[PDB]
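Quick one - inputs below.
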Amino acid sequence: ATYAKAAWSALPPVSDTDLQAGFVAWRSSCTRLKNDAVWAKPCATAAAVSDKDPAAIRQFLQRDLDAYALRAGGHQADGLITGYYEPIYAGSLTRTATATVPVYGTPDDLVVVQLESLYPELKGKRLRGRVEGKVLKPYDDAGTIAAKGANAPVLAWLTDPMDLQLLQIQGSGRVRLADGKQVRLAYAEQNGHPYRAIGRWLVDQGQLKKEDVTMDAIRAWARANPARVPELLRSNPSYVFFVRNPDSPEGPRGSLNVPLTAGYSVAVDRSVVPLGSLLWLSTTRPDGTPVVRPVAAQDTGGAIAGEVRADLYWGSGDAAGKLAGDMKQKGNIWMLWPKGVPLPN
Amino acid sequence: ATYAKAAWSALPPVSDTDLQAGFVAWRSSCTRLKNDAVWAKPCATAAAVSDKDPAAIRQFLQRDLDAYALRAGGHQADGLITGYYEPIYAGSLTRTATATVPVYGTPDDLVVVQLESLYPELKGKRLRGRVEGKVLKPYDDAGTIAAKGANAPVLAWLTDPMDLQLLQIQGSGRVRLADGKQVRLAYAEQNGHPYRAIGRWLVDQGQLKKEDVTMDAIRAWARANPARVPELLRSNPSYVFFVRNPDSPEGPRGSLNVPLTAGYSVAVDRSVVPLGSLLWLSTTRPDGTPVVRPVAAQDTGGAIAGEVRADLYWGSGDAAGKLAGDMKQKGNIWMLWPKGVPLPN
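Output:
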């Protein structure tokens, strides 16, 4: 990927609504770049800037920053904008006859093995176990936690084991309670067993074809095969544990551990685009509505290779999920950069 | 590397005394080989041969077994025959002003990590640690144990920390008490830190040249540099714990859990030479005198990496140790093998 300087007048205009929202989402991450190489003084400048003055935003941007078009190879500046979202699942604080699937916090008999300093070849492996006598042995796999429960507090109860599996894959989500209040859940720990996507088990068993395996297809197969749902979820021996964040309307936290804003946060390649960077996005919704806005690189998703890419966070819930799933849009991306500073490799 | 079938008449001759002692050493493994797919049947046959009848032994071998020259690397059949022994060191059952170095059994808080069913790539490693909160930390390294001790049973007290290091390298030893009586020590466990020969440290410090590194030269350097012994020995972060046996005449036990015979037991590469196998050995003693004999694979040595290699157990005591330390001899090794049975792959 290459950076190609662009005049402020070459970028597409944005409405005042989008300029401010995208500025507010981007400055939202300033509290965590107070001592960042490149963004601290921009932020300090921005901290002074109002957020209800478009003229004052444009001043700050065009005065303090440069713009660079993101180009890859062959398609050049024309890239691909996909989408992602935070799911919301029906559930309860308490077991009922409809909500029987427990979501567990971290067990305190779960021991994290931490021997990387003696054996570097262990980094990235998530080794965990239970200590019985003088031996650290494998922790309970997923199948065993589904049958017998966990030695851990229950943070919430879901209505469908398939909702638990998806929640454990994504690492965060909200639980909708009956009184409309919501529970914030995020990754905390893992049983130490290697992940094995249930999709792959559906291919080997001869139930789907590698190209047919979507989320919507696994869900359809499960609903068609209620007897086999336990076998299916057992095939992934890995089991994820959660923490419950304070109740809040903020969006989930991403890799920058800043609450994502719906419509104004993106997942990028951290190399090509440093986390915290301000971007300019021109693309469309699946229905063709122009999407032209500043957006903040506040999360990670970058396997960039021969074509520009970013993932746009569209919010939480089923409709955000539907919007995010249909996102396959041609788009252009500019990275904004503080003027003096040299850009990154 | 490779097994090259050889005719019996290509093997060098052995005296009747050597043929008898080597048969006897090897036959003593048969008590541990009753469930061996390879050696069980030969052992049943062997049990009925008179160990006082050379002709019956040679008959049994030539009838029921084939001979396979071992070869590896550019030297092919020419290999390296080193030595080991059981050292005997003056010491005490109790701490005195002349015996202050403790020999430890297995600590109560030493946890063995046993996650290989989940990650088969761990299978070579001795992973160990101590549990601190919900974390398995590295256990204290050799240097920390030497300086501060360990929470473990004390088995004996030595006068010189170099003696402990040697004892930890050979894995077995005797401690001579003031009343002439002796106590047996054998390997029981280790702190999980990777071994690093102290010889390598002295070379890295330009104190010895890679060719002069012998046990004699290392001990000489330590004599001349008492103030640097603690840093010399902690350069090997591995620390070995022992078990005490009651004194007895028999040889120490190797990995096959069978008492080793001086001059007729070898430590081998366990994958190339399965424990319990009978071998033919042709080499010399350091003074050049011929050593031609059957020997038994009854211990585990360093794996074969481009050179054929075996460690010859020479017995216990200082004289055995001088012999074992001078052993650096060209050798030929044949593995014997029951007819019809597939070789190891």
